[PDB]
Amino acid sequence: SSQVEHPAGGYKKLFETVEELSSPLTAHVTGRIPLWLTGSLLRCGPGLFEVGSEPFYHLFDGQALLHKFDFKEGHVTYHRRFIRTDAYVRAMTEKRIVITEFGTCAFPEVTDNALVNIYPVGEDYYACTETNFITKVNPETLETIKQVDLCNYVSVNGATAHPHIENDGTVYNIGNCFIAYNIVKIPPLQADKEDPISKSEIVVQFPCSDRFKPSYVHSFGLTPNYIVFVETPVKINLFKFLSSWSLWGANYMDCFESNETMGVWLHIADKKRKKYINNKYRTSPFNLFHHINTYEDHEFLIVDLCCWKGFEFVYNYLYLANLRENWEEVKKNARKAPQPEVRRYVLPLNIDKADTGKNLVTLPNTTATAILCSDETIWLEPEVLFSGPRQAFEFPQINYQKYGGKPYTYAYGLGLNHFVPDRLCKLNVKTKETWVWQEPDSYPSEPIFVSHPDALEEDDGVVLSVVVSPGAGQKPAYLLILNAKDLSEVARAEVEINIPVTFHGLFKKS
Amino acid sequence: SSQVEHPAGGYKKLFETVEELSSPLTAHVTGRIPLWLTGSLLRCGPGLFEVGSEPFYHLFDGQALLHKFDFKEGHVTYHRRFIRTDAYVRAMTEKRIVITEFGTCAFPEVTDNALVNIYPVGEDYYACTETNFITKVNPETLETIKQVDLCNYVSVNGATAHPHIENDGTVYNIGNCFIAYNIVKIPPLQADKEDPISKSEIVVQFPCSDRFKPSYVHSFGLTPNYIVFVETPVKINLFKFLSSWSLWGANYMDCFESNETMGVWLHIADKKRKKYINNKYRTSPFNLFHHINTYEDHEFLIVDLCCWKGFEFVYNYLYLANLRENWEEVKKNARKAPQPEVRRYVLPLNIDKADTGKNLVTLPNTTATAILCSDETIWLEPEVLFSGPRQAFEFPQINYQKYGGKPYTYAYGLGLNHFVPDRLCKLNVKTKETWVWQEPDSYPSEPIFVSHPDALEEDDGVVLSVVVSPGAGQKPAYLLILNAKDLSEVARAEVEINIPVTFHGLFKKS
């Protein structure tokens, strides 16, 4: 949990417009940037929160900004450019908001505002949001290269900002299809050297709980042998979605509603046999944005999730007007919100009818349960890994390249305090022990893990976070480096301009 | 959690018959019994596990045995007598099992085998089970005084072994009524000096979820202003219950079944206005035996519970044949059992219709939620206070006289390890910090708290536990005294005879 209040309101700098740079700045280092750290931290976020006098209303509406911190020989640079999306270009052209963003209707056509994340396919990098348009970008110059419409290649209406990436370069993702949820597989770059998006395909299909209302889906789970998809009670109302939008005046946020009765339905597919498994896993209601990690232990899937306890859409609390309130008002607003909680679900693969009425989760080191009912539903209870009052462990990351889809011990995350990011956390998922890094009036981003080249252990490396530190006595922002073992500060690299909120990113080694 | 295995099988001495004494033994003390500790530890449990060659099958079938440890001027005695119940007396008379116990049918009339607990009414003490018969006993001589039939006074078919006791002597309890659940209030001893059981009355009534199937109920919650009752999916099947028993040949265990779909319904009544409150609090399925404590915080009830995750009846795992298995087999048997978990529920008293869809639990220091649905059900999620794999924090106790029904910080309990009691625990319910006391091949009982008489602090006292320590190098058993602050050992008082399992009790000051 946080041990800090924010009466000064410095967090408002997260949602304040900034200018791009025309070339890299030097970041002034204190401490020692590790000498083995060679590459680029690439991150996406909104950078422009109004077009002249027309404002963006929601956290996910600001125009995409691509950020880069470079590391070489203990020296650091910072660079950023706006992504030349249709939404951005046409807004600069017409000096107004032209494309409807997530929660901002444009007055007189799907947004490609790639503000959420960046990821590799083949030798290319794509910035993304959650729509059908992803944007190829140049990771060295931050120049915008091309828009790609995923509907040109595969049958999905959108895809998450959270594709899984196997070590050989294979990319998996999930998207709604107008009804089902499809898993797209993009293969690695082959000897022919043609673009792997051309070779995309749907490999498996998850069914929908309601024919005219699919669930919102933000991420999913992957293991060597299985795909896990969590169907929540936050639904997209297709009657409001497909009807004339600039007649009534609707945005994306206007089409969400909550199913009160369904709870959460969990779904598994066989990855290698490309087949849906018909096990009716069921639990109580929560919003889910981020899977932490998924793995196989004897005949059981371990599913670690950052949950929000309730069925109201957490995104209702992320309008900019609310996030820019004063600290007492921010806290008051979050009182009725769903409660964050890290939970471990355990999904049995072997269901024997003879065990009807009993707990199938026979593993020796969990309290998660799964109960086979007579109607063949499997009712799940979680093991809580972390719980603090309006203290979210969110934006989780692990040592992904060596432990994704595999037995693991450590997660890192951003700590939210009534939605305000004010700390960095590490969680031992076996023991439930936690570590915190926190300074007053300091607003960090998602921590990203980078392994030491000679690492023998899971947490032998550093985490990188972008921290916004307003209020004089400091420079406006800095790149923070923490030791992954205990979250003790290794270095920081200060820059002389403000940085807004960023969501997701990656480290690109070189 | 436990840090100990039990391959030697010493826990089998908990379920082995013993002889009563004709007068007190000295307990050999090591360490220093506190000089302010003056009174009697009184405890109940089964002492006779077969009548000749007819065996009792279930943990709750053995004939009631009343135990007493006396403390005066740093010196200790131990004494025990069988309770001369009908069941016991008639069994000694007829040299066979005459009355049907909980899970042992007698072959050719309700049991009064008072093996569970002992409690004060007026100037008297009553040993009890969960039936309509309670047994007045003499707390100094351990003589049986009389049988009391509660049906002679008030309209209930049984009452729990867990009445609440307000400081003025007022006694509340709950019982099934063949359909409703009635709260009985027995008033304190008055100036007229007549027996308070004659002044018993039903003050409030809780409804039933199913007309022909009432839930098993073991305990309930009480605050200055409210009564809380938790209706679980472990049901008593009245069609099997009332039909002729010694025709086919049924016991009590044969009449329990699990409702798969209802989950858990929670109920509040207004204590002082003697009125049921019509709030439909609902959650996922669990067995419940012990409430820890209940209290009021602003307009919310805090409900702390020792839960078992699942709907199968935990009592299915407590046949003596299973509990007497070898360690590897005991562990294997418990694998499919419900998982123990300490949970905090938070029940809002002010339900506004305007908050439909939202989390009503606006308190600042909990992660528990309560969600108002459109059908006016209030869906609850807990805050988990403690969770270990087949490690139950059970038989909870608090500093009851000063903190029962009130804001509190500390609970004590018996740690079960795949149902085997092998340690003593303290839980800070605000911070979730735990303390453990454990020695190899040592099988403790419920810890009972005793305040230093001049304590201002909640945990300024000691806990007392009866510990069975088989295997040579020690005497068969001992009374343990721990400091309540940190569970460090203060003294023990060894006795030269075995003691079987005991369930509940009290400290009687003098």
Ligand SMILES: NCC[C@H](O)c1cccc(OCC2CCCCC2)c1
């Ligand atoms: N990061 C959360 C919001 C997301 O950036 C976003 C921004 C703008 C539009 C969106 O639409 C999601 C739908 C889902 C169904 C298919 C079409 C896209 C989603």
Ligand SMILES: NCC[C@H](O)c1cccc(OCC2CCCCC2)c1
């Ligand atoms: N300690 C748990 C079991 C309890 O000792 C016990 C022992 C013997 C008979 C019982 O009967 C419970 C019924 C419930 C319905 C009303 C009558 C009593 C219950």
Ligand SMILES: CCCCCCCCCCCCCCCC(=O)O
């Ligand atoms: C760095 C963000 C701080 C301000 C917003 C915090 C509220 C986040 C709620 C949980 C995560 C929701 C998903 C947002 C990230 C994403 O778009 O992928």
Ligand SMILES: CCCCCCCCCCCCCCCC(=O)O
């Ligand atoms: C000292 C007891 C150890 C063996 C029994 C352990 C399983 C207990 C399950 C939860 C409590 C059930 C109620 C038993 C005490 C009672 O009858 O009130």
Ligand SMILES: [Fe+2]
């Ligand atoms: Fe995300």
Ligand SMILES: [Fe+2]
């Ligand atoms: Fe009990």
